[PDB]
Design a protein around this ligand. Structure first.
Ligand SMILES: O=C(N[C@H]1[C@H](O)[C@@H]2O[C@H]1c1ccccc12)C1CCC1
Length: 283
């Protein structure tokens, strides 16, 4: 079926939970043996969220190459994404090592450091220009260059320096700051505006490594971001945009990381975002 009328048909019939459970039943199951090794327990935020072995990002380190991060490679859309958990106190150096080694231009953050009165990720970037951060375990230096605070999101320019080689690179930090503590946003308008700002920066384009996207577990809000982006790109590429099937795209993405889209409300919100976004694109 088309999307917008399939949407109204699920609303009128109140069957979002059943649609979402079907997706959960059909989703891929691949091994995640490296994630479960005892030496990696303090590298995982949640015991039930792990990268598959076949798609995990490897650190370029001979001691321990493990990070909780996955490469989502979308062949028809010609887009790739790295989805990862919010960094932990003992993985902030690994996180920036990955950004460096994978040649990423942009980092997309969809959570606040504290939500619901608890810590959802480490403070992994500097908050003042004159107070830079040094990660001694991976030999990187990170400096805040500029910050632009808007009503729904903040964009930061960061400098990452590899202290071994003295090479430097500019990284863009895109921080969506207004996702509610509970539920999903009422309108997708600010989330779509944010997606378009990431696109306009070059961070999603083939001349760079994959964008790094995270929330707390790296599957819920993060899944919504890449699902909406890929579906909109396919609607622009194809002769028949009504042939894009959001459930099929989501199942394709779940071949590369488990659990993408965590609730039926997040699924409905993803439909809403693609539907509204397809009208603004045109034409
Ligand atoms: O090359 C880098 N760091 C080097 C450190 O001197 C040390 O050797 C390298 C390294 C890599 C992983 C852990 C520890 C080390 C950074 C470029 C991204 C990582």
């Amino acid at each position: 079926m088309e999307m917008e009328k399939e949407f109204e048909q699920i609303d009128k019939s109140g069957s979002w939970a059943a649609i979402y459970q079907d997706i959960r039943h059909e989703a891929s199951d691949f091994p995640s043996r490296v994630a479960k090794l005892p030496k990696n327990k303090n590298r995982n935020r949640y015991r039930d969220v792990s990268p598959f072995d076949h798609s995990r990002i490897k650190l370029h380190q001979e001691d321990n190459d493990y990070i909780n991060a996955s490469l989502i490679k979308m062949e028809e859309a010609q887009r790739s994404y790295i989805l990862t958990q919010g960094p932990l106190p003992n993985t902030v150096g690994h996180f920036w090592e990955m950004v460096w080694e994978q040649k990423s231009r942009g980092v997309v953050m969809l959570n606040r450091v504290m939500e619901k009165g608890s810590l959802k990720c480490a403070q992994y970037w500097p908050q003042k220009e004159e107070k830079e951060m040094i990660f001694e375990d991976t030999n990187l230096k990170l400096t805040l260059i500029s910050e632009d605070i808007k009503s729904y999101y903040t964009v930061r320019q960061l400098e990452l320096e590899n202290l071994t080689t003295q090479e430097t690179r500019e990284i863009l930090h895109f921080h969506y700051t207004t996702w509610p503590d509970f539920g999903v946003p009422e309108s997708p308008a600010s989330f779509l505006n944010f997606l378009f700002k990431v696109r306009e920066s070059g961070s999603l384009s083939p001349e760079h490594g994959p964008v790094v996207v995270h929330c707390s577990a790296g599957i819920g809000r993060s899944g919504t971001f890449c699902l909406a982006d890929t579906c909109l790109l396919l609607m622009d590429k194809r002769k028949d945009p009504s042939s894009v099937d959001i459930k099929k795209v989501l199942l394709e993405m779940r071949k590369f990381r488990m659990g993408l889209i965590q609730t039926a409300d997040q699924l409905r919100f993803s439909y809403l975002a693609v539907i509204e976004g397809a009208k603004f694109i045109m034409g």
